[PDB]
Assembly symmetry: C3
Homo-oligomer: 332 residues x 3
């Protein structure tokens, strides 16, 4: 009986950070309680000041990373305040039945609902909104995130030995389709309903106008760059709810990668770049060996450096000249 | 001597259904005889009534799924009736030599040919027409299908234990490139030769106008939805002869997936979404655990819900509230 | 101490050929010395005579394949002659630290530099230029290649048994984005700086105008077709520094494939087609079983046959009628 299980309430954090958890499960199965509040809000997504009407779980793009263990029950209270204008729901790729929960969680503004599902498969998974007839519009307005379902005994390598991360980050990658006029400037809209047909037209080009990490060009740089130390083991969970991506750590690797994110499989070793299919979350484990700045990108470099899909690590520690050195510095 | 082998004649069925076969081979190697008749025909591919000139094997898009076992010989009689206007051939990705059979099977209208090849590698494979100089036009006009070459002892999981499907479906996914004018309406053509340069121009955009399962928007819905029962093990073979796709069962998973379709490899477990590369067939095995409607989609959701790449399962049986339940139904 | 190690100097060859090497390492770790000279040069990339300003390592697109063994040190002298006009550098996906070497190798025209890095991970890897702010422009101007880091005991199959290739080829696949006017003709430019904004605009379409192997439409055909004999084991290393591809040997297979190119993983068997993500090198091993012409393509067949991503093998030897035969040749 589920009512006999411990309940634990989790307060979610903003990406790229992840709420506190234990890799190896320190209790038996639990009901893990999450609350998310849907927020429709204006967001500036690039340096030019382009502004879209984002559709968010808990105020951010992507929505926050939820973390549980296999055979836990996820119980989500989803709140759609009357300050929103649209109906929303949620579909968990981690769940089984009713369109991942979508058919059960349809909330008009001013409504709320509570869904519970059993996390029967270990892995990182996409979650996203999916209202009948308007699915890609909501997903491509930012209304998606991920959930990680850890094996009860934590992560394992291809030989079945433990892998333990010191830090974990969640990189949500978002394709936006800002409608353009004939001349190619971004078009502006007065209401959701007035925006919709132009939103559909832009999407159908299959050409994103922007592709960003954590909701905006440059969001994971500067003061908000990811950080680590030489010697630290870092897990980067990466999701793309609608379109393929190919993550790459410039100057590093994916030492162990579950490119399609499912932990009952052995990881792929020593990856330079890996393909995360649209509608998927993946995870990469890396131990840093050199200090300095790294870029973490979608390695369609146009998508990276022109459309926005690039962030940075700043890594502290000792430089290893055995691993790499400049023998003769650039000179004439 | 091949003439010493049993011969078995197979009458093919229309996708998404698959001709009768046994997973575990009940005989020694055989010559398996298939006949396909090429049909050029008009097809309505969307709700708006858009009509293209489809190029088909046996009257359908995709062509039918052929099923044999490893080390069987496939003997195909390919008929090009004089009511067609184009030369066609066939290339089997399952075969070895002469461009998969293409160099040997070139048939003008009013001709026929018989090809035999040995199915030396187990897996699902694309077949498609490929006439020199006009390959993508034929393939993207619908002239492709798949063949499944089963291991003689049937399918196995990642541990080498048997996997046995109760039902099997074949989902052919087709990218069409309907030429558009300046204003963006579909352009109309009086003959194949008159259509060709505009067909090439549309293809070169690399942007499909339609992406459909079983030949049309909505073809696998309603009375033609796929079906199953809770507890049933279902194999979905999925092919894309020209362009990448990322299949996903909404509300389910791929319990065991050969994303690139080759059965000597262990399957990937517990997949939410998987990448089938253009020019490939893949296969996913799932045991249904919940009743109700599922959508089965390409999880580029724009390709799914705007361009046509979505079908449904209707699944009967008992709802499992342990697996998923609405704790509090949507309310204000 | 690295100064105690043998030094070996390698003179690189032009793709698709590969400098001489041993699969099983015949010495202990070495410092392997390579020199590459950057050349900006005009290149004709199609049959129509379209001419771009290519940015090359050592005069070719792709740059040459470098070959070393795991735990060797790669020491590259990179020369940027004063006859070039741009600043360039190099990033090795095989290397660890300073953006793969990019942050250390920035050379203005008339400068040179020497980088050394330890090849700690076995596999095929992309290398490419990546100057801050101009990365995709350089990469999509042809300024990329690959490096193969062989396991010290050579290649292994999925069971840990030796795989030994008789021949090896390197296929570099290049996406170009030639800017077009309103009417769709290729636009012409007087200097790099004058070309740049239009180069960016074209790239942002995410639609290549050309996709070629070894630098031009038809480069691996005719007198320059790849060759082999029935019975020969051939390794095809394939790279795509910026955009996904899905290689396929028409009439053959990838008997053993490392689609994302990293040799500590078991290969995928019997592949028809495989996905190499942008920013990745992959490798396929095939034993030819039939003579004749094969095409080797990106199996988005529009990208292959319209945009340029197709080459040929010409294979000599004995035809095997057991494997494939025409039972009845095409006739009315
Ligand atoms: Cu929504
Ligand atoms: Cu989904
Ligand atoms: Cu045809
Ligand atoms: Cu093919
Ligand atoms: Cu450069
Ligand atoms: Cu790179």
């Amino acid at each position: 009986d589920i009512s006999t299980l411990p309940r634990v309430k989790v307060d979610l954090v903003k990406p790229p950070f992840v709420h506190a958890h234990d890799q190896v499960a320190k209790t038996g199965p639990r009901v893990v309680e999450f609350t998310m509040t849907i927020e429709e809000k204006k967001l500036v997504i690039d340096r030019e000041g382009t502004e879209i009407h984002a559709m968010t779980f808990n105020g951010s793009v992507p929505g926050p990373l939820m973390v549980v263990h296999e055979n836990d029950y996820v119980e989500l209270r989803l709140i759609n305040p009357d300050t929103n204008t649209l109906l929303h729901n949620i579909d968990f790729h981690a769940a089984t039945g009713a369109l991942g929960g979508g058919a059960l969680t349809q909330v008009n503004p001013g409504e709320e609902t509570t869904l519970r599902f059993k996390a029967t498969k270990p892995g990182v998974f996409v979650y996203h909104c999916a209202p009948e007839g308007m699915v890609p519009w909501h997903v491509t307005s930012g209304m998606n995130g991920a959930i990680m379902v850890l094996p009860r005994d934590g992560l394992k390598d291809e030989k079945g030995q433990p892998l333990t991360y010191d830090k974990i980050y969640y990189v949500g990658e978002q394709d936006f389709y800002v409608p353009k006029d004939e001349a190619g400037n971004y078009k502006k809209y007065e209401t959701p309903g007035e925006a919709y047909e132009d939103a559909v037209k832009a999407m159908r080009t299959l050409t994103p106008t922007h592709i960003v990490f954590n909701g905006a060009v440059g969001a994971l740089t500067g003061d908000h760059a990811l950080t680590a130390a030489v010697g630290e083991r870092v897990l980067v969970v990466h999701s793309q709810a609608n379109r393929d991506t190919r993550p790459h750590l410039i100057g590093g690797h994916g030492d162990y990668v579950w490119a399609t994110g499912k932990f009952r499989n052995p990881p792929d070793l020593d990856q330079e770049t890996w393909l995360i299919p649209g509608g998927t979350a993946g995870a990469a484990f890396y131990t840093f060996r050199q200090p300095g700045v790294y870029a973490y990108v979608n390695h369609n470099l146009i998508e990276a450096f022109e459309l926005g899909a690039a962030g940075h690590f700043k890594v502290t520690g000792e430089w290893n000249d055995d691993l790499m050195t400049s023998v003769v510095k650039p000179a004439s």
